[PDB]
Amino acid sequence: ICLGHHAVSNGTKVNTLTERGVEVVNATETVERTNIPRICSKGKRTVDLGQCGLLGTITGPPQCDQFLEFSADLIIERREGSDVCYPGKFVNEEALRQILRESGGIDKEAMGFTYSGIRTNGATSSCRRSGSSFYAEMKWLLSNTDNAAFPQMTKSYKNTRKSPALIVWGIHHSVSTAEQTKLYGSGNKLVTVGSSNYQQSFVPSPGARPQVNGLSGRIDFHWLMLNPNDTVTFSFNGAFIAPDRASFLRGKSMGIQSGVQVDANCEGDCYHSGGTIISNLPFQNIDSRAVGKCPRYVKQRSLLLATGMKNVPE
Amino acid sequence: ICLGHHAVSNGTKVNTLTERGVEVVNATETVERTNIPRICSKGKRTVDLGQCGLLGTITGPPQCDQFLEFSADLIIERREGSDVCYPGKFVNEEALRQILRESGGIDKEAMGFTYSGIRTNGATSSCRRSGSSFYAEMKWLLSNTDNAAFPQMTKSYKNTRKSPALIVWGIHHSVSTAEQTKLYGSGNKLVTVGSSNYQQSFVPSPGARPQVNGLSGRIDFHWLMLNPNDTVTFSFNGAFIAPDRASFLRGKSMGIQSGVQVDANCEGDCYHSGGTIISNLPFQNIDSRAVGKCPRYVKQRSLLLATGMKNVPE
Amino acid sequence: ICLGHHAVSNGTKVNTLTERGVEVVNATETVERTNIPRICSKGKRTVDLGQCGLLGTITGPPQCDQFLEFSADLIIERREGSDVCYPGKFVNEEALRQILRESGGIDKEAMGFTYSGIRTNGATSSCRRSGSSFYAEMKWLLSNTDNAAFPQMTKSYKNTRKSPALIVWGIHHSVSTAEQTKLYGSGNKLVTVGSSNYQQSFVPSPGARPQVNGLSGRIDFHWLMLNPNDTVTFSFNGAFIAPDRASFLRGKSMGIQSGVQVDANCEGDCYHSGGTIISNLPFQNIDSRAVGKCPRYVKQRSLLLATGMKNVPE
Amino acid sequence: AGFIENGWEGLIDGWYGFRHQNAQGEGTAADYKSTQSAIDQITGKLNRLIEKTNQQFELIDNEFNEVEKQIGNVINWTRDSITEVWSYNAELLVAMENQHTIDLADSEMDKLYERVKRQLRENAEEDGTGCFEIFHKCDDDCMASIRNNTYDHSKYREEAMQN
Amino acid sequence: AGFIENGWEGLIDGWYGFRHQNAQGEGTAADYKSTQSAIDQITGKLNRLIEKTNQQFELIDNEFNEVEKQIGNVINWTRDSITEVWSYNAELLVAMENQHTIDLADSEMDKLYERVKRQLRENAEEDGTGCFEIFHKCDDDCMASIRNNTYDHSKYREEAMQN
Amino acid sequence: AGFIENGWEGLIDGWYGFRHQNAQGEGTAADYKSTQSAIDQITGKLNRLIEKTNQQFELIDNEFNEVEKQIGNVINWTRDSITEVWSYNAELLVAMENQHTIDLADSEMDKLYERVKRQLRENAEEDGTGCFEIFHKCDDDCMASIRNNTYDHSKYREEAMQN
Ligand SMILES: *[C@@H]1O[C@H](CO)[C@@H](O)[C@H](O)[C@H]1NC(C)=O
Ligand SMILES: *[C@@H]1O[C@H](CO)[C@@H](O)[C@H](O)[C@H]1NC(C)=O
Ligand SMILES: *[C@@H]1O[C@H](CO)[C@@H](O)[C@H](O)[C@H]1NC(C)=O
Ligand SMILES: *[C@@H]1O[C@H](CO)[C@@H](O)[C@H](O)[C@H]1NC(C)=O
Numbered sequence A, B, C: 001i002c003l004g005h006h007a008v009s010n011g012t013k014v015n016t017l018t019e020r021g022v023e024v025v026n027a028t029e030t031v032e033r034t035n036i037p038r039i040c041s042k043g044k045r046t047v048d049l050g051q052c053g054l055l056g057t058i059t060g061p062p063q064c065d066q067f068l069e070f071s072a073d074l075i076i077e078r079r080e081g082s083d084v085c086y087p088g089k090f091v092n093e094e095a096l097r098q099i100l101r102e103s104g105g106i107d108k109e110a111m112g113f114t115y116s117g118i119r120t121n122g123a124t125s126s127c128r129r130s131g132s133s134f135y136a137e138m139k140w141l142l143s144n145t146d147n148a149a150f151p152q153m154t155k156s157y158k159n160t161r162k163s164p165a166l167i168v169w170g171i172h173h174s175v176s177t178a179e180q181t182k183l184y185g186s187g188n189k190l191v192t193v194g195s196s197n198y199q200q201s202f203v204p205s206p207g208a209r210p211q212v213n214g215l216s217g218r219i220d221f222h223w224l225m226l227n228p229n230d231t232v233t234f235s236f237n238g239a240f241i242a243p244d245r246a247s248f249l250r251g252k253s254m255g256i257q258s259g260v261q262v263d264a265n266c267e268g269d270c271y272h273s274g275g276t277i278i279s280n281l282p283f284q285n286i287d288s289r290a291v292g293k294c295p296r297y298v299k300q301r302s303l304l305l306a307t308g309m310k311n312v313p314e
Numbered sequence D, E, F: 001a002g003f004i005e006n007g008w009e010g011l012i013d014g015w016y017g018f019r020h021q022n023a024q025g026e027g028t029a030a031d032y033k034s035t036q037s038a039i040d041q042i043t044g045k046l047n048r049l050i051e052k053t054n055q056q057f058e059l060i061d062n063e064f065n066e067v068e069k070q071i072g073n074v075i076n077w078t079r080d081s082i083t084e085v086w087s088y089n090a091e092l093l094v095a096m097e098n099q100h101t102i103d104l105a106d107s108e109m110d111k112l113y114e115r116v117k118r119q120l121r122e123n124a125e126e127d128g129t130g131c132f133e134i135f136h137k138c139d140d141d142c143m144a145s146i147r148n149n150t151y152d153h154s155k156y157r158e159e160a161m162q163n
């Protein structure tokens, strides 16, 4: 009576502590390479921003009119998105983006600002709606007449809610100093925002810029986060885009950047720009910048784990 | 004659490479969970800042009068601490905090600044001592009379010691431009600090701020680090809080933030906000932000290491 | 017939999972400690900057006249290097250094800037060549006569190449406001750079600084990176060091800081300030800040790997 | 897998088994308990390695608008370091698990061989190539008694001892 | 811990031991050298794992005044990555150490069994369940000679060979 | 390396070997295949551990002009964390590899001993200290037949069984 073990004619070579290419009976893969070229969003509140930029949802350009008070568990940024309609830029833009990606949506509230002795209906041809408009959440403050002066103003806002408020204002930079005198008058303009954690400090810089959307003027967007019962104060005398509504974070979510379509048929927690990684393997060799609940990225494209015995054929 | 091994009626289940719940004879814990709700400071020079803020020890508000030249191996920050008496803020505050946490204390030295043609005894009601005072290490420079002008001044300081010096000055921001003309006169004010590694650049921004301690004025605190034999120079014409004494790092220490009491009866090198972690285990599941000489934080609350054989009872 | 194993009179003690000091037959080292006190550059295009600073290669001080269009696979910075001849400093200097370290060299191209109504041959005694010169890649713009005014100017540059362009300009800070009126005239000066990713914002700050090279004036160097077909625009009215030639990254390289000599006889991919680490071992205990293709740094100075059996002598 | 000079490619019913050749006929039957033991151990390894992490990592870069070059170089430096750590851990993990798997199967085979050896006290003698020489013709019922561990170690003793 | 079908819950004196039953009486004595060997090995494992680090890590966050949101997200990202690495290392470390511990104890038991087996050359025969059948009534003095490895392998040979 | 009470310091020709002492003379010859097996395994360990990484890490600090203190503290914090991870991985790697190396050599020795034991079925008896007692004077040609695994297990049986 002879006893032994099984064997196969064609095994699978694996690597061990000792050798390289040990032919075993059975083996399975541990490094995931299969990628689903879609954003698997089955069972999640998804907001595809599309042509709307993530920061725009706070200021409200025409492309973000349907994203002013969104709510989602998964936020998708697109490459065609734009934060601005009038050529501008955000200060500390990426930090605000990372804040809004995990915000779970935003909730707007009227700040309750009223004015006396100044105009307020500033508009432009780039922020187009019915005709010439502006940012839906902002107000372009100017001087009452086509020139004149700007009275030194001080407007205050107190956060009466239990969550931190997102306050965003804008400094204007016209094509020249003459246009600045046309909009707000001559003299040195100064904008001051102060609170409990904040302390600035804002002065305009007119000049000629490259024409974006046929416009050489720029708008600097700034933002601070008021704490509950904390009060913020603005002291401005021109070149000031006033905030009309403040934002409040709804809850929690995740933000990704992708260029593939949305699919509610598959479910996944690991996302990258090329799709969703659906796998139970502990490692993956698809994208080192994948976010969510992912297998850990490794440089090896394959690491075969032995599931059978040593294969010794006749 | 039969030979065998021992066994127990109630063993301890552990996890291995193969199974989950293998009942062995004896096992010990590897993930620490017991926390001492005190700051174990036995054998260390400890300074509990209390109501004094860490940065205040450089400027010297009334609550930091007994911390101007402290010396410690362990620095404890409290939540009730305050860096300022007059409402203000530090530029690059967290970097300066991290510098002061491992400084081993500070040593002050008179910078030797004398003035001609200006006042110097500026004070306030918030920085209260006997009556109305100011920062002990700073001097509030004003114009001689209740209005007048400020002569363009240039004061220089050379670090004659072998260690880098901490230089801290302050720009003033009054409630309005009229108060700025009252303190320092009309015209654009400009503050310039220059050395070998530094090059700024300072202009004031008056305006109305929310009343902190009944005051709407602010003070920006700035700081640079002079190298040995390197010279720093200030060119100012108003809105300038001049430094009176420079700081020098004593040696080495550690800085923690906590809210529990200090105990000189227990010794420990691993601290967190809830107390001290005293353990010989390689891992801990108490606080991922623990500092000092700590076991590495893990997410598992327990990982039982087998110290006995396999338990096979009858 | 008795069978057994071999043994030696003097073995090597190693560490295992169980014991500490197990005497085995043979053992080899796994933590590298031998260091070659030279920069092994065999087979690589090497540029030893020497007295030329890395950033200077963009602006062109006299010490960088032979590094304006260098090309290398390995860039070595020296401690005696200097980025400036006239006392100045770079804004975001370390990011630009890290950009230039892996640039593979730089390629200059005339930006094509012509002027009308202003002088352009500003020079100094510190940037010495034949006599009194200036930065080779920059132009010191002044007013035509010894005082007068500066006309508000707007110069534009479009990147016509497929790679991002490095644009570097300079703001001047004279010893006083009187010298600023001498060079560029009275009034508030303002410099504006704008593009697609950039938006500033520049105003001068005259004042007295410590004399570096016998000069109390400073020059702030700023830089942006134009994208292909993107256009940058400058609107300046004084205190402006104009760029004459833009830079383009050649390819790819590595940047190190060292103080040892260059050796083309040895080859190595792991560099530190003290030389080159040439080893096949997986770990090293020489320098934790070694760059290139290095063994991973460990704190242990030696970890003996057992290559023989257990040594049991008589 | 050492002195057994090979494997039975024809054994498609299990991992380990016997192959008896007496005077009545041939036989090849797989052993279910040892095969199920090794299969259970490998299955446990797969259950431990195939794992899902509940740790969510958020986006720290920006593929559409590059962040600051300095903080971007720090982010890339950290990500590359962590990638090296996880590549090392994956390589070493797979290699070690494969080693312990092969040694585990070999151990199961050896322990089975020693089991049958201890069942045949003096009625059989080791051949040296993984077989057992029986000094008395064991019929198929005796073979089945050997497989299910019911062969009597004394009721066949004297006959084999004489041979 | 395989063919020994169990453990002796009554063996409170050591880890391994004997339990003899001859004509004079009963016996259960623990083996000190093997038990001390396994205890020494496990003790070494504890001395290696229970370790104190001399690496001091400083405070990088701020619990009272939150730092910049960007650098705070980078700090949290790095800390979470390192936490994942150390959780993995801890899990795998504990699992591997437990595996090698169990296999270590089993190995010590087997090597002891083989020791006593080599002490009894032809005077005893393996039973198959971890016991040794002696073909001559070994008294308690002979048992004590077996325990301390002094039993003569030839001065009891012929008597057992006849039986 | 357990019951073989020592090693032969005079065995300079290989790792494992024999040392026979019959009536014709003395003998000490190294076994090439087992020694080459263990040497091949250790060599494989060295080929796996001695490795070159193709991952290039760029300079993130500045030794000549210190960077921002905050980002410098984050860089030092991350570098120290990674250094702790790699020191742990190096220590555990070396310790585990040494353990498996020692156990590997011991395993090879034991399997060789069992090989020669299976070559001598009933013509020899185990002594208990790693030697085999032969009940018939095996000459040097018989010794050479034992070394190269050609000794006949039956053409010397009856003579040793009588003794
Ligand atoms: C071989 O391994 C794979 C791993 O995916 C498994 O699905 C399959 O059932 C295994 N086959 C056998 C015969 O065990
Ligand atoms: C906020 O202020 C309101 C009214 O002043 C008060 O009732 C409430 O308790 C405050 N809450 C906090 C958290 O300060
Ligand atoms: C069981 O393990 C613990 C670990 O703390 C140890 O203190 C104790 O002495 C052990 N008991 C025995 C009987 O080994
Ligand atoms: C600093 O300056 C003093 C006097 O000028 C000189 O004696 C000393 O050597 C200098 N030390 C350094 C480190 O420059």
Ligand SMILES: *[C@@H]1O[C@H](CO)[C@@H](O)[C@H](O)[C@H]1NC(C)=O
Binding pocket: C026, C027, C028, C307
């Ligand atoms: C001992 O180990 C070293 C490792 O460098 C090796 O070079 C040498 O050949 C080894 N000696 C023997 C006899 O194996």
Ligand SMILES: *[C@@H]1O[C@H](CO)[C@@H](O)[C@H](O)[C@H]1NC(C)=O
Binding pocket: C228, C229
């Ligand atoms: C850049 O512009 C030129 C001319 O306007 C055009 O031919 C080219 O395709 C453009 N390339 C890109 C990448 O925009």
Ligand SMILES: *[C@@H]1O[C@H](CO)[C@@H](O)[C@H](O)[C@H]1NC(C)=O
Binding pocket: D066, D068, D069, D070, D072, D073, D076
């Ligand atoms: C970091 O790596 C990504 C690719 O993974 C690259 O696009 C990016 O430019 C790198 N960061 C910097 C600052 O170059």
Ligand SMILES: *[C@@H]1O[C@H](CO)[C@@H](O)[C@H](O)[C@H]1NC(C)=O
Binding pocket: E066, E068, E069, E070, E072, E073, E076
């Ligand atoms: C990082 O995590 C801590 C809790 O561990 C949290 O308080 C903090 O807000 C986080 N950082 C940011 C930028 O949200």
Ligand SMILES: *[C@@H]1O[C@H](CO)[C@@H](O)[C@H](O)[C@H]1NC(C)=O
Binding pocket: F066, F068, F069, F070, F072, F073, F076
């Ligand atoms: C980081 O460590 C280096 C030495 O490795 C030291 O020179 C440097 O000062 C440290 N960083 C800071 C911010 O102190």
